[PDB]
Design an enzyme around this catalytic site. Structure first.
Site, PDB file in Angstrom:
ATOM      1  N   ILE A 216       0.662  -1.226   0.016  1.00 32.55           N
ATOM      2  CA  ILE A 216       0.036   0.071  -0.034  1.00 32.55           C
ATOM      3  C   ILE A 216       0.898   1.196  -0.143  1.00 32.55           C
ATOM      4  CG2 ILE A 216      -1.744  -1.231   1.304  1.00 32.55           C
ATOM      5  CD1 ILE A 216       0.042   1.469   2.955  1.00 32.55           C
ATOM      6  N   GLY A 217       2.140   1.201   0.166  1.00 33.98           N
ATOM      7  CA  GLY A 217       2.834   2.558   0.049  1.00 33.98           C
ATOM      8  C   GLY A 217       4.365   1.990   1.052  1.00 33.98           C
ATOM      9  N   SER A 218       4.983   3.225   1.234  1.00 35.81           N
ATOM     10  CA  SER A 218       6.306   3.074   2.062  1.00 35.81           C
ATOM     11  C   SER A 218       6.019   3.907   3.257  1.00 35.81           C
ATOM     12  CB  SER A 218       7.476   3.520   1.064  1.00 35.81           C
ATOM     13  OG  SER A 218       8.750   3.752   1.874  1.00 35.81           O
ATOM     14  N   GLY A 219       6.891   3.316   4.263  1.00 36.48           N
ATOM     15  CA  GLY A 219       6.893   4.138   5.329  1.00 36.48           C
ATOM     16  C   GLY A 219       8.291   4.743   5.511  1.00 36.48           C
TER      17      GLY A 219
ATOM     18  N   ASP B   7       8.847  -1.154   4.220  1.00 41.24           N
ATOM     19  CA  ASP B   7       7.504  -1.157   3.148  1.00 41.24           C
ATOM     20  C   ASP B   7       6.371  -1.277   3.989  1.00 41.24           C
ATOM     21  OD1 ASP B   7       8.965  -0.436   0.952  1.00 41.24           O
ATOM     22  OD2 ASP B   7       8.987  -2.243   0.306  1.00 41.24           O
TER      23      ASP B   7
ATOM     24  N   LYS C 149       4.137  -4.084   8.257  1.00 44.47           N
ATOM     25  CA  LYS C 149       5.441  -3.223   7.959  1.00 44.47           C
ATOM     26  C   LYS C 149       6.666  -4.241   7.927  1.00 44.47           C
ATOM     27  CE  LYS C 149       7.957   0.842   9.078  1.00 44.47           C
ATOM     28  NZ  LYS C 149       7.739   2.058   9.946  1.00 44.47           N
TER      29      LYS C 149
ATOM     30  N   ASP D 234       8.240  14.042  13.011  1.00 46.93           N
ATOM     31  CA  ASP D 234       7.480  13.930  11.484  1.00 46.93           C
ATOM     32  C   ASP D 234       6.000  14.431  11.472  1.00 46.93           C
ATOM     33  OD1 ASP D 234       7.770  13.910   8.931  1.00 46.93           O
ATOM     34  OD2 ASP D 234       8.107  11.951   8.562  1.00 46.93           O
TER      35      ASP D 234
HETATM   36  C1  LIG Z   1     -10.419  -1.435   4.779  1.00 42.28           C
HETATM   37  O1  LIG Z   1     -10.437  -1.131   3.426  1.00 42.28           O
HETATM   38  C2  LIG Z   1      -9.096  -0.482   3.077  1.00 42.28           C
HETATM   39  C3  LIG Z   1      -9.506   0.396   1.983  1.00 42.28           C
HETATM   40  C4  LIG Z   1      -8.323   1.217   1.315  1.00 42.28           C
HETATM   41  C5  LIG Z   1      -6.991   0.956   2.290  1.00 42.28           C
HETATM   42  O2  LIG Z   1      -5.794   1.665   1.451  1.00 42.28           O
HETATM   43  C6  LIG Z   1      -5.711   1.974   0.277  1.00 42.28           C
HETATM   44  C7  LIG Z   1      -6.782   0.403   3.306  1.00 42.28           C
HETATM   45  C8  LIG Z   1      -5.568   0.078   4.063  1.00 42.28           C
HETATM   46  C9  LIG Z   1      -5.590   1.447   4.831  1.00 42.28           C
HETATM   47  C10 LIG Z   1      -4.246   1.630   5.683  1.00 42.28           C
HETATM   48  O3  LIG Z   1      -3.253   2.065   5.196  1.00 42.28           O
HETATM   49  N1  LIG Z   1      -4.285   1.078   7.471  1.00 42.28           N
HETATM   50  C11 LIG Z   1      -3.092   1.319   7.955  1.00 42.28           C
HETATM   51  C12 LIG Z   1      -1.842   1.796   7.623  1.00 42.28           C
HETATM   52  C13 LIG Z   1      -0.874   1.871   8.498  1.00 42.28           C
HETATM   53  C14 LIG Z   1       0.515   2.639   8.100  1.00 42.28           C
HETATM   54  C15 LIG Z   1       1.471   2.038   8.568  1.00 42.28           C
HETATM   55  C16 LIG Z   1       2.131   0.823   9.286  1.00 42.28           C
HETATM   56  C17 LIG Z   1       2.910   1.071  10.622  1.00 42.28           C
HETATM   57  C18 LIG Z   1       3.143  -0.037  11.338  1.00 42.28           C
HETATM   58  C19 LIG Z   1       2.851  -1.166  11.079  1.00 42.28           C
HETATM   59  F1  LIG Z   1       3.155  -2.365  11.546  1.00 42.28           F
HETATM   60  C20 LIG Z   1       1.984  -1.356   9.738  1.00 42.28           C
HETATM   61  C21 LIG Z   1       1.641  -0.445   8.962  1.00 42.28           C
HETATM   62  N2  LIG Z   1       2.687   2.945   8.210  1.00 42.28           N
HETATM   63  C22 LIG Z   1       2.151   3.874   7.450  1.00 42.28           C
HETATM   64  N3  LIG Z   1       2.737   5.283   6.877  1.00 42.28           N
HETATM   65  N4  LIG Z   1       2.299   5.705   5.853  1.00 42.28           N
HETATM   66  C23 LIG Z   1       3.128   7.017   5.692  1.00 42.28           C
HETATM   67  C24 LIG Z   1       4.462   6.780   5.768  1.00 42.28           C
HETATM   68  C25 LIG Z   1       5.406   7.779   5.483  1.00 42.28           C
HETATM   69  C26 LIG Z   1       5.005   8.856   4.772  1.00 42.28           C
HETATM   70  F2  LIG Z   1       6.045   9.689   4.229  1.00 42.28           F
HETATM   71  C27 LIG Z   1       3.757   8.920   4.162  1.00 42.28           C
HETATM   72  C28 LIG Z   1       2.855   8.063   4.847  1.00 42.28           C
HETATM   73  N5  LIG Z   1       0.841   3.659   7.461  1.00 42.28           N
HETATM   74  C29 LIG Z   1      -0.374   4.484   6.965  1.00 42.28           C
HETATM   75  C30 LIG Z   1      -1.087   1.339   9.764  1.00 42.28           C
HETATM   76  C31 LIG Z   1      -2.334   0.903  10.130  1.00 42.28           C
HETATM   77  N6  LIG Z   1      -3.361   0.737   9.133  1.00 42.28           N
HETATM   78  C32 LIG Z   1      -7.989  -0.415   4.004  1.00 42.28           C
END
Ligand SMILES: COc1ccc(OC)c(CCC(=O)Nc2cc(-c3c(-c4ccc(F)cc4)nc(/N=N/c4ccc(F)cc4)n3C)ccn2)c1
Length: 286
Positions: free
Chosen positions: A8-11, A15, A30, A120
């Site tokens: 779904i993107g990068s952190g 990833d 992650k 950040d």
């Molecule tokens: C149910 O229907 C859906 C429909 C559409 C959907 O999406 C297209 C989804 C998915 C939604 C989602 O993303 N949910 C989510 C995300 C994160 C996360 C982590 C993350 C952190 C720790 C973990 F262990 C795992 C993930 N890191 C991030 N970084 N964002 C960044 C970093 C750097 C930047 F410069 C900019 C943005 N995010 C958003 C954590 C928890 N939930 C569902």
């Protein structure tokens, strides 16, 4: 127990993947390569664990190593405020900005109470909850977080200069552009730029190109230093300028008056005639 779905993107480090807990539920995943270079994921996981239990702090469900990756599994959260900003046509009503401001200041206060600074603060790092938590603002991503005081003595870290900019340039504080060590005031100043970004739909230092990254940051720094708060905030309630001036005048090791900053926006909220029904702009999409 976890099936990896689509990326779904990068952190900030590693990833991010939409994933599935095969037994039960959907989750966010992650990944960090276990052996590429200096590791980061396990430290970030340790911070989340220290943050555990706080309002708007995500729950981690498992963190370990599986083959070629360090893996962290987080409860699934809803869209980020940047996502919702796009869905609301990249403009938030005043009521929604004030509702968000109230919670975001609190999330930053909570992190600061646990001896850390985030470094950040930006819309992408705030996500709405789901279900019974759908009205709750969460904060995510501690990859750049740093301890600003000692756990036992609360001795503040020393003042330092000539530091490279860490975090996102668009929302960075002026002192960060000037190479000063970040502290609590800087998280709050960044939030102030985030709130005016929501109000305005953009910031006047967005979209500036140059040759090297240093030159681009330099343009952003100059534009920020040369734009007075009363000009940035022209046409909007005075609370936003009061908020930013307050953050910019805090000393390096000052404890911010989080309550006063919230009260600024609460007083405005009530003078505008709004009701705290937690109805954000996106709750009105049909
Ligand atoms: C149910 O229907 C859906 C429909 C559409 C959907 O999406 C297209 C989804 C998915 C939604 C989602 O993303 N949910 C989510 C995300 C994160 C996360 C982590 C993350 C952190 C720790 C973990 F262990 C795992 C993930 N890191 C991030 N970084 N964002 C960044 C970093 C750097 C930047 F410069 C900019 C943005 N995010 C958003 C954590 C928890 N939930 C569902």
């Amino acid at each position: 127990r976890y099936r990896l779905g689509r990326k779904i993107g990068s952190g900030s480090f590693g990833d991010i993947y939409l994933g599935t807990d095969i037994a039960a539920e959907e989750v966010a995943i992650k990944l960090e390569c276990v052996k590429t270079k200096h590791p980061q994921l396990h430290i970030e996981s340790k911070i989340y664990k220290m943050m555990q239990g706080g309002v708007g702090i995500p729950t981690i469900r498992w963190c370990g190593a599986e083959g070629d990756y360090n893996v962290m599994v987080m409860e699934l959260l809803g869209p980020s405020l940047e996502d919702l900003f796009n869905f609301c046509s990249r403009k938030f009503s005043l009521k929604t900005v004030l509702l968000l401001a109230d919670q975001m200041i609190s999330r930053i206060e909570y992190i600061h109470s646990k001896n850390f600074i985030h470094r950040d603060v930006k819309p992408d790092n705030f996500l709405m909850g789901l279900g019974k938590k759908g009205n709750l603002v969460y904060i995510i991503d501690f990859g750049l977080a740093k301890k600003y005081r000692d756990a036992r003595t609360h001795q503040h870290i020393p003042y330092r200069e000539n530091k490279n900019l860490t975090g996102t340039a668009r929302y960075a504080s002026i002192n960060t552009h000037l190479g000063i060590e970040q502290s609590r005031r800087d998280d709050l100043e960044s939030l102030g730029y985030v709130l005016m970004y929501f109000n305005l739909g953009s910031l006047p230092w967005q979209g500036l190109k140059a040759a090297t990254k240093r030159q681009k940051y330099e343009r952003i720094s100059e534009k920020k230093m040369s734009t007075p708060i009363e000009v940035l905030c022209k046409g909007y309630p005075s609370e936003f300028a009061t908020y930013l001036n307050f953050c910019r005048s805090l000393r390096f090791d000052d404890k911010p008056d989080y309550s006063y900053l919230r009260q600024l926006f609460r007083n405005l909220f009530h003078r505008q005639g709004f009701s705290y029904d937690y109805v954000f702009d996106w709750n009105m999409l049909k």
